[PDB]
């Protein structure tokens, strides 16, 4: 059946000899060359530039809370930055984080030393870990640390930031102690002496250029990701490809999810109107989500394939008619191709003189076997 058009005709008629005439055998159809997707000029990226790029950060004794939601965030962008050093991620990996969705993406900011960077691990203990900030055992998210000795470093000494050196009670995850009640050093009661009996819990950082890695002020963040049985408001952004016209493509214009040939159109939409329809109630035109143009949509060209043959006793040559098809979009092509209102005629040569009709093609064209 699939050897050549004459044999397809034989298969359709279930006969080994086909009489003179035009027979519909196959059904031509054009498949999309590529998939095209476009989304408008809107990003609403989460305010990472404000939280990371700033002048002064919140100290560790009051670890700040950011509460970032209802925005798309490209975490791999910062994962592809040029400054970050520590990227020890707990639970959800950033590459899957971009794919996965969370309701809220909390961020933190506190000032810790290089040796105490390991303390931000879930359940890790230490001075800062057990007094200033502690992460729960079941944390999911990433903590980012990097070296910055030129922005937040002082030659004489950085004593602005300070930590909770002493704390009577036991810290719990997601807890803060902003009150500055005076510590009780010994078993004697404390009455604000600031001497042997009473120690000052908030001890100042000492930052010097000659200090080691365990004494250097680093800019760290805790990207706390949690599930609150709520609709997800933070998700990964989606890319839009380039635009192509006069070609059969698969388009997803903000949910139009159709296929067809996009072309320029003179029709104009109303400013609020997005796409158009017609009598048949089918998608007719869509405006560009990015820019302001109107793209008329025409479905994929398709039509019956009719094999034009004389009787097998006369000959075995055939001509193939591609109904309602332009010969730009079309026996294999290149053998006396011809265009008429019926469609593309392949295998037959147009002749200027006119004879009586033998095999009716359509729109006044008739094919015949001749010298």
């Amino acid at each position, epitope marked *: 059946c699939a050897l050549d058009p004459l044999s397809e005709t034989k298969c359709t008629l279930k006969s080994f000899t086909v009489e003179k005439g035009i027979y519909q055998t196959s059904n031509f159809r054009v498949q999309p060359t590529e998939s095209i997707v476009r989304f408008p000029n809107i990003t609403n990226l989460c305010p990472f530039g404000e939280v990371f790029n700033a002048t002064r950060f919140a100290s560790v004794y009051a670890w700040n809370r950011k509460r970032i939601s209802n925005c798309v965030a490209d975490y791999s962008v910062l994962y592809n930055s040029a400054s970050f050093s*520590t990227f020890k991620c707990y639970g959800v990996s*950033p*590459t899957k984080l971009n794919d996965l969705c969370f309701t809220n993406v909390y961020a933190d900011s506190f000032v810790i030393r290089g040796d105490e960077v390991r303390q931000i691990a879930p359940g890790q203990t230490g001075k800062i870990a057990d007094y200033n900030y502690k992460l729960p055992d079941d944390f999911t998210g990433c903590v980012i640390a990097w070296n910055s000795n030129n922005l937040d470093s002082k030659v004489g000494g950085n004593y602005n930031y300070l930590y909770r050196l002493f704390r009577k009670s036991n810290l719990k995850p997601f807890e803060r102690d902003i009150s500055t009640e005076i510590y009780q050093a010994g078993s004697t009661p404390c009455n604000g002496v600031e001497g042997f009996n009473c120690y000052f819990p908030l001890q100042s950082y000492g930052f010097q250029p000659t200090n080691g890695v365990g004494y250097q002020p680093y800019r760290v963040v805790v990207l706390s990701f949690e599930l609150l049985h709520a609709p997800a408001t933070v998700c990964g952004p989606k890319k839009s490809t380039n635009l192509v016209k006069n070609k059969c493509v698969n388009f997803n214009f903000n949910g139009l999810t159709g296929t067809g040939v996009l072309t320029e159109s003179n029709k104009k939409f109303l400013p609020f109107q997005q796409f158009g329809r017609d009598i048949a109630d089918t998608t007719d035109a869509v405006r560009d989500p990015q820019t302001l143009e109107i793209l008329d949509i025409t479905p994929c060209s398709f039509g019956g394939v009719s094999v034009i043959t004389p009787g097998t006793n006369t000959s075995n040559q055939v001509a193939v008619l591609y109904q309602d098809v332009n010969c730009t979009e079309v026996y294999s092509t290149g053998s006396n191709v011809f265009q008429t209102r019926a469609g593309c005629l392949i295998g037959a040569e147009h002749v200027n003189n006119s004879y009586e009709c033998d095999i009716p093609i359509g729109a006044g064209i008739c094919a015949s076997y001749q010298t």
Partner: antibody
Amino acid sequence: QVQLQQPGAELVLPGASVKLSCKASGYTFTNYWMHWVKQRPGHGLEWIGEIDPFDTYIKINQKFKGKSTLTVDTSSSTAYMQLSSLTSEDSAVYYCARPDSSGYPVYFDYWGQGTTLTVS
Amino acid sequence: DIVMTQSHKFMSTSVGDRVSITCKASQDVGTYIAWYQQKPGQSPKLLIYWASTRHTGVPDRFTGSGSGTNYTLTISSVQAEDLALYHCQQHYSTPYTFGGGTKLEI
């Protein structure tokens, strides 16, 4: 049990190109960047470069620019590395290093088997 | 960038003696260093990912101590399996550089 498998023992004539692969198993292929290192008894180890998976962010060390090329195939957890115009001094052992963390810098906590390159 | 080069030519101590493994640094970049145990005919094995804390599967004999200017590693006890190459690699910037390595011999 992490399986970092390298066939090794490949020889290519001078002036041609080479292709090497490194299969990764025992962990998740998605959650780790790729970092390439080179082993030489002449002056110790050295770093070839890094490539992130399922993307085309190229970052190679300043010592081995131009000749070195890296490609990543998601399927079968293989990494594609190519040199051009191999010289006689390129007789050494090549490695693929699984990193400790997903982000730079990394100290290449776990190393796989050694692939030996030699002019034949 | 930063260049790693140890000072001592080789490690030459008997069984149980205490020896030091140096790893000089071009400039002060903190304790951003690693250590590899590359047996002759075997791939490097992790020993010291950080000076303060040691990674999984390491003997307690090996000690971590970062000077800040150059990196030195001291082993309290030495066994037969401790004879290998000591490669030291710094992790502070995108270009990574390894040390010259030293092979322990008795």
